[PDB]
Symmetry: D2
Subunit: 129 residues, 4 copies
């Protein structure tokens, strides 16, 4: 895919008392950013037409710098097809002008039927990206 | 009802960078405490036998003191029936030995059918409390 | 003040398994919207120049309709000064074209010194709104 | 270390509308469980006596099964020392009687000074485990 961009602002809800973003939250921001790549309409169409859904199977996170209250960051997201069944997503939290990401995620998503068996990703949901 | 007690420990997820529990979280703790009064089995039975569910209609919160990281507090919960349709819950966050609550909530819950019409609370779900 | 507008999109993180936004989350959205009215720079200036901060003292919520996954709503926020010490905020979650709010909050905020005593809100933090 | 156990109950706050625990939440539960291994008193002592804190550097998650509303699970946690600076934590969400974990996390934590340089973990914070 191309690199998608999704802005995230850090609010009170995002920080803990150590004074930085509470680390589990980054996976939430990554999930949000993915919802802008494969939106709810696409997911609903996949479910109704094909009986398929995507699930996160693995998420490997590297936390490289603390992020403060009131920062606006850019979530950079791209994915590749890995065979018929799996999508591998690279997601990164960036600051303007930085030379490296604050947080990196490698996310593996599988395409499952209602019997929780792997099924090929249909061509139509992939087509726009 | 009687006064129910539910312990809550304050973890990193609960605080913000101002150094106290992030205020929207108290309503979560109140919801948890209510799940110990009317558990999931009772809710499921209500839904399946009667087609009814409870919804929070109003929540009035008073935040009287900040709560710090790593505190263990006691959520005190009681409710009264208000007519046929409504339950009024008093919920309070307490510290050991305090003379007043840290946080107070008055919560009004309604009993709704699938048409979102008010319906009487059945006698069976109330009986144990 | 004037009516401020803040968009909120409903993601997976926002819903529960009953199929609507989990009610404590609305107070979070209200907090976000307030951060766009009195931003972090203003708060920091208040703290450093005056030794003052704002705290939510009371929040009275009415939940009038369920909000679904993937909705985009408009948070409408306005406030009034109530004497020297207190700000009263009206916040509402709206859908496009609706005639009434999905969720209403009346929020009372106090202006406190480090001794947790009420102090007058300085003219400068109010001036732009 | 030995295997520590920490119970987690799944409440409304934990699920999303797909009907299972929202995946970023598992890292929160893992953080909680770690707070029962190295409690706030130990962390505070480390900070004040040594000027050191722990940070999560990497978290590798495998999501092997969906977890439903109202389940009670057991978080199993153990760690090993990896050289002088790093602790490697294995954390797992288990159901009673299962033969495999629902969710697995491998978490790498580093011991940092205020200059964000790696420093040896002191013997005293490790001693009880
Ligand atoms: Mg198709
Ligand atoms: Mg019955
Ligand atoms: Mg001034
Ligand atoms: Mg020492």
């Amino acid at each position: 895919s191309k690199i998608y961009h999704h802005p995230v602002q850090i609010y009170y809800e995002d920080t803990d008392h150590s004074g930085v973003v509470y680390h589990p939250n980054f996976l939430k921001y990554f999930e949000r950013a993915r919802e802008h790549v494969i939106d709810s309409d696409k997911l609903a169409t996949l479910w109704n037409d094909h009986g398929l859904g995507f699930a996160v199977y693995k998420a490997n996170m590297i936390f490289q710098d603390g992020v403060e209250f009131a920062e606006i960051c850019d979530i950079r997201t791209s994915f590749t097809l890995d065979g018929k069944y799996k999508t591998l997503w690279r997601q990164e939290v960036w600051r303007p002008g930085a030379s490296r990401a604050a947080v990196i995620g490698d996310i593996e998503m599988v395409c499952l039927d209602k019997e929780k068996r792997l099924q090929p990703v249909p061509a139509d949901i992939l087509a726009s990206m």
